[PDB]
C-alpha cells in the first residue's frame, strides 16, 4: 500500500507517490 | 496494435499503444525529482510540480487553464523521489491541443516572478494536506533517516524554504534536469508518428544527460517525531536491492510472503504472516505490513506498523521476530507460491487501468530503456526461488536498520533495542 498522497485537482493535479505504508485495517480495528 | 518503442537520436524515448479507446492519455516522464535536488535548492521539485499551470512562452496561464478545461481535459503532475510525470488525458479528437500545452509546460516555462511568489503558498497548503495522513510524514522521516544523500530529500518542500524558492532555481532545475536523454514521451491511444512529430517539434532542445545526482548512501539513523497521536506509526527498514535486479524480485516475493495488503475487506489477513504473528501477541487494534521501496541506485525493505502507543514495542518486536523466523529458514514452498501468485496478480491488476499502464511503461522506459512484456515480468517472478526469499530475509535481519516513529512514542523501541 504505497498510499500515494494524491491531491484532488482539475487541470492541475499534483500527485506525489511513496512506498507501501500499511494503514490497511485501522478503520476495521 | 502493440506498444512501439523508439529511442530517438537525442535520447528521448517515444512509446505509443493505439488502444482504439474513446480517451487518449499522453505522458512525459522525466528523470527528475527530490533526489536530484541539492541542499541549496531543496523543495524546488515540489514547486515545479505545483507550477504546471504557470505562464509559458507558448501560452499564458489563462490560456492553458481555460483550454484544457474547455476540451474537458486533465493535466496531472505525478512526482516520485526519482521521477516526475506530466500527463494529459482527454478525448482522442482533441489530443493535439493538450499535447501542445503539455510540451509548452515541460519545455518552455517562464517562471515569472509574480506567479511563483503567488504559488509559494500552495507549497504550504499542499504540504499540510499531504501530512494529514501520518503515513506521509513517517515515510518522509524514514527516507531522511535511511539515506544521508539524494534519496533523503523530501517530496515536499521543507518549511524554511516555503517562501524562498526562486524563479532562477526553478529555471536551473528545469534546464539541468529536464533533458531529452532523461525524458520519455508515453502515449495511449495516440499513433506513434504523431507523438514523434511533436517530440521533434518541442523536445529537440535541452539535449544531453544533464546534471547527475550522487549515489544514495545508507545512513542507518532514526527520526522520532513525538506528535502525540494516539496510534504510533513506526517503520523499520534495511537496505535492499535496486529496482530491476534479481534480489529486487526476491524482496518483492518476501514482502508478499510476510504480508503487504489485505485482499478481503474487513478480513484477518490470514495469509499475511506478520499480521497473525502480531495478532496472537497483541489483542488491541493494530496493523502491520511490509515496506518494499526500490529505486535505481538502491532500495529499502522493512516493516511498517500502526498500533496503540502502549503496545508499539510488542507489535514491532513480533513483526521483527517473524521476519527473523523467515530468515532462519522456516519458509514453506506453498507460502512462496502463494506470494508469487499474489505479486503476479498485483502486477496485472496495476497495469489493467490506463493510468497504471501508462505509469508502468514510463517507469520501465526511464529506468531500463526498453519495455518488457507482462509475461516476461511474470516469468521473472516465477524464477525467484525460496532460497532467494530466505537470503533476502537474512539480509534484512543482518543489515543495519533505519527507523522512523511518530506518535506518543513512550514505549516505541529504539533501533538499538530492536
Amino acid at each position: 500500500g504505497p498510499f500515494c498522497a494524491g491531491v484532488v485537482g482539475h487541470a492541475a493535479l499534483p500527485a506525489t507517490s511513496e512506498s507501501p505504508v500499511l494503514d490497511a485495517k485501522r478503520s476495521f480495528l | 496494435q502493440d506498444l512501439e518503442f523508439t529511442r530517438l537520436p537525442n535520447g528521448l524515448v517515444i512509446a505509443s499503444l493505439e488502444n482504439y479507446a474513446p480517451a487518449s492519455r499522453i505522458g512525459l516522464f522525466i528523470k527528475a525529482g527530490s533526489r536530484y535536488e541539492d541542499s541549496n535548492n531543496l523543495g524546488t521539485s515540489h514547486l515545479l510540480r505545483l507550477a504546471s499551470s504557470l505562464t509559458t512562452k507558448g501560452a499564458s496561464s489563462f490560456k492553458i487553464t481555460r483550454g484544457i478545461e474547455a476540451v474537458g481535459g486533465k493535466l496531472s503532475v505525478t512526482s516520485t523521489r526519482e521521477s516526475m510525470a506530466y500527463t494529459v488525458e482527454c478525448l482522442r479528437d482533441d489530443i493535439e491541443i493538450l499535447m501542445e500545452f503539455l510540451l509548452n509546460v515541460t519545455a518552455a516555462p517562464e517562471f515569472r516572478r509574480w506567479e511563483v511568489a503567488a504559488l509559494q503558498s500552495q507549497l504550504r497548503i499542499d504540504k499540510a494536506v499531504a501530512f494529514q495522513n501520518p503515513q506521509a510524514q513517517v515515510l518522509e522521516n524514514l527516507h531522511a533517516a535511511a539515506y544521508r544523500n539524494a534519496l533523503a530529500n523530501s517530496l515536499y518542500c521543507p518549511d524554511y524554504r516555503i517562501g524562498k524558492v526562486t524563479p532562477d532555481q526553478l529555471h536551473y532545475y528545469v534546464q539541468n534536469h529536464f533533458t531529452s536523454a532523461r525524458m520519455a514521451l508515453i502515449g495511449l491511444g495516440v499513433s506513434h508518428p504523431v507523438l514523434k512529430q511533436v517530440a521533434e517539434r518541442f523536445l529537440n532542445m535541452r539535449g544531453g544527460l544533464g546534471l547527475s545526482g550522487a549515489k544514495a548512501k545508507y545512513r542507518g539513523g532514526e527520526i522520532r517525531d513525538q506528535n502525540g497521536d494516539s496510534l504510533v506509526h513506526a517503520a523499520l527498514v534495511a537496505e535492499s536491492a535496486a529496482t530491476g535486479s534479481a534480489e529486487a524480485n526476491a524482496f518483492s516475493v518476501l514482502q508478499h510472503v510476510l504480508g503487504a495488503g489485505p485482499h478481503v475487506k474487513r478480513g484477518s489477513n490470514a495469509t499475511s504472516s506478520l499480521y497473525q504473528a502480531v495478532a496472537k501477541g497483541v489483542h488491541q487494534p493494530f496493523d502491520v505490513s511490509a515496506f518494499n521501496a526500490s529505486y535505481s541506485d538502491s532500495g529499502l525493505f522493512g516493516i511498517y506498523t500502526i498500533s496503540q502507543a502502549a503496545s508499539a514495542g510488542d507489535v514491532i518486536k513480533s513483526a521483527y521476530d517473524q521476519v527473523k523466523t523467515i530468515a532462519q529458514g522456516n519458509l514453506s514452498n506453498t507460502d512462496v507460491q502463494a506470494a508469487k501468485n499474489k505479486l503476479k496478480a498485483g502486477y496485472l491488476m496495476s497495469v489493467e487501468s490506463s493510468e497504471g499502464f501508462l505509469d508502468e511503461v514510463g517507469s520501465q522506459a526511464l529506468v531500463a530503456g526498453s519495455y518488457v512484456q507482462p509475461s516476461t515480468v511474470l516469468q521473472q517472478i516465477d524464477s525467484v526461488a525460496d532460497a532467494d526469499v530466505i537470503n533476502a530475509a537474512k539480509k534484512f535481519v543482518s543489515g543495519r536498520k533505519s527507523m522512523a516513529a511518530s506518535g506518543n512514542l513512550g514505549h516505541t523501541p529504539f533501533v538499538d533495542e530492536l
Binding site: - | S60, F62, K63, R66, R113, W114
Partner: protein, 99 residues
C-alpha cells in the same frame, strides 16, 4: 522633426522638473496597479521615492534644480513592458469572454 515637438512637450510637461519620469505620472487604474505590483523591488522603491520627493516639492511649491531635472533621452519607461503584458492578458481574458 517629430522628435523636436516631442522634446518640446517633454519640457512643457513639468514631470521632468519635479524629478519624475514619464511612467511615474501615469494614472493608476487597475492595469497600472497590477503593473506596479509586478515591478522588481529596486524599480518599485525608486518609483516610490521619486513620487514622494515630487509630492514634497509640490507641497512647498518649489522645483528641482536645473541640473537634476530628468533628461528626455535619459527617461526610461520602466513600467511599459509590465503594463503592456497586463493589458495583453486582460485583452485575452476579454476575448475569451466574448465567445
Amino acid at each position: 522633426w517629430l522628435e523636436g515637438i516631442r522634446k518640446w512637450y517633454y519640457n512643457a510637461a513639468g514631470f521632468n522638473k519635479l524629478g519624475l519620469m514619464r511612467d511615474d505620472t501615469i494614472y493608476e487604474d487597475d492595469d497600472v496597479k497590477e503593473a506596479i505590483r509586478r515591478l522588481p523591488e529596486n524599480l518599485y522603491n525608486d518609483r516610490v521615492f521619486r513620487i514622494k520627493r515630487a509630492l514634497d516639492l509640490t507641497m512647498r511649491q518649489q522645483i528641482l534644480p536645473k541640473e537634476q531635472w530628468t533628461k528626455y533621452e535619459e527617461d526610461k519607461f520602466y513600467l511599459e513592458p509590465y503594463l503592456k503584458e497586463v493589458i495583453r492578458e486582460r485583452k485575452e481574458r476579454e476575448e475569451w469572454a466574448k465567445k
